[PDB]
Amino acid sequence: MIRLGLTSFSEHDYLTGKKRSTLYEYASHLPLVEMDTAYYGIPPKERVAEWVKAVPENFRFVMKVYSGISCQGEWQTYYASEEEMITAFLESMAPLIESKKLFAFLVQFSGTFGCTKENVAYLQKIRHWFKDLPIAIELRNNSWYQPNFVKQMLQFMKENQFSLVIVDEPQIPTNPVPFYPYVTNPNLVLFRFHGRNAAGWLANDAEWRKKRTLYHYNTQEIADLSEAVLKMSQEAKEVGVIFNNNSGGDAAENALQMQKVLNLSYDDLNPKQLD
Amino acid sequence: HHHHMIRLGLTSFSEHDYLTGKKRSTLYEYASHLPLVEMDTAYYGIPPKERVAEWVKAVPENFRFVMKVYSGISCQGEWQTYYASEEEMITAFLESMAPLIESKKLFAFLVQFSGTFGCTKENVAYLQKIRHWFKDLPIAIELRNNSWYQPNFVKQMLQFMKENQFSLVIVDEPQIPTNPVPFYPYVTNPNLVLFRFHGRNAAGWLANDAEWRKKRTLYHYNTQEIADLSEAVLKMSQEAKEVGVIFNNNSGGDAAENALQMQKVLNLSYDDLNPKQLD
């Protein structure tokens, strides 16, 4: 099975018709979402249970971990230890964990997170922090993908059962990772498309925040990306896909375009109308 | 003849429905009530030169801005994210704030550091690096780690600020059992002072609590507390030319009232913008 999803469930009016949509409404169209809620602050267990209750049996969640864990944030800010930060996170996510609706905890690392002895150790630290949970590592630094590291890194990922996210980001003259279809964990793969707005990037441009995921994958690009998704589904059990190119609002459209190209069905929630 | 002057302000201008009446308030509407405001817009991302100019154009001649610097500069963020060098990140920031600087409506660039930013040789170096970056501009430094305020550092530190013309922010935060900074009313820069009242919600603090995000600035100063804070400001205004005060205790919406409550106590006036009955 191949699950196509989007980041955020409320901001996809193409998918649902309404400007702000509910998770229930969302899960009447796709069987997958990424949620970056916890990234900015670990939510209460009760609200995580609201999400679980709002979706089908077949539905899955890509849950982005707290920035304190992926190192953009600081554990010190609200927690007395790195250990207690994880404890807080896992206690918050228990409802999602126990429900079997977790696709994987996404651990997106900064662009500055490069291939060093420390960082490799930290990746092992994360393995230990998330006992036997599905962890998806998104590297955004081509240093890991250099000829002298690639093969040993991929091996590292396999050993630690890490599902290395397959990333399609704009190939800016910095350190963007390549679109490298490869299954590190056969039990689950994760694609993440951020658009290819290479043109539109300027050095020292603050608006790159908005432009970096402003893209409408054309009919050709979707065909090529689909072929990759399909090729990894041969080598993997679960295969997740998250379209993140939504600065223009194109995410939902491009995802359903791929659904057609991959020819996929649905057993989601259902519609109604009253209030 | 210029007299030393006091300004009471708040963080952001829109959500203060108390002193405006409207749920969302404009900067113009805000600037018909108080002479000062802090804006944290740049902290999350450096805005365009154009929008900064709009702010300047929407306020009186004697209105002042406390402009919180980009997170990449105070180190909560990474300069790498959008810039080719620490240097170009500063160029980008100062080109953006060009209108605000040239208007003479800038009170100070606020540089708030993390709680993890304690007293270190490397940290002191970065402060001097900041001094360089901001040439001859007003810089208010807010430290949030008591390591700087220990007996073996505090005095040496205060001199460091004086010598680098830094206006060390007088902080008033919840005195949690962690590394909170004490209320230390002291003028490091006689040309400008800056208070920042974050509240005193020590009770309500839980270790490993994520909701401390909202609880930490959730407080309503009582008349006794306002009087105590007022006396502090009155003391510093005698030693300083310009004194700023930013009420940041607005998780419950109380900042506005507490600020105006202090205004009555300090007994202050205004000749800023003017209200209107149209929209």
Ligand SMILES: [Cl-]
């Ligand atoms: Cl991103």
Ligand SMILES: [Cl-]
């Ligand atoms: Cl704060």
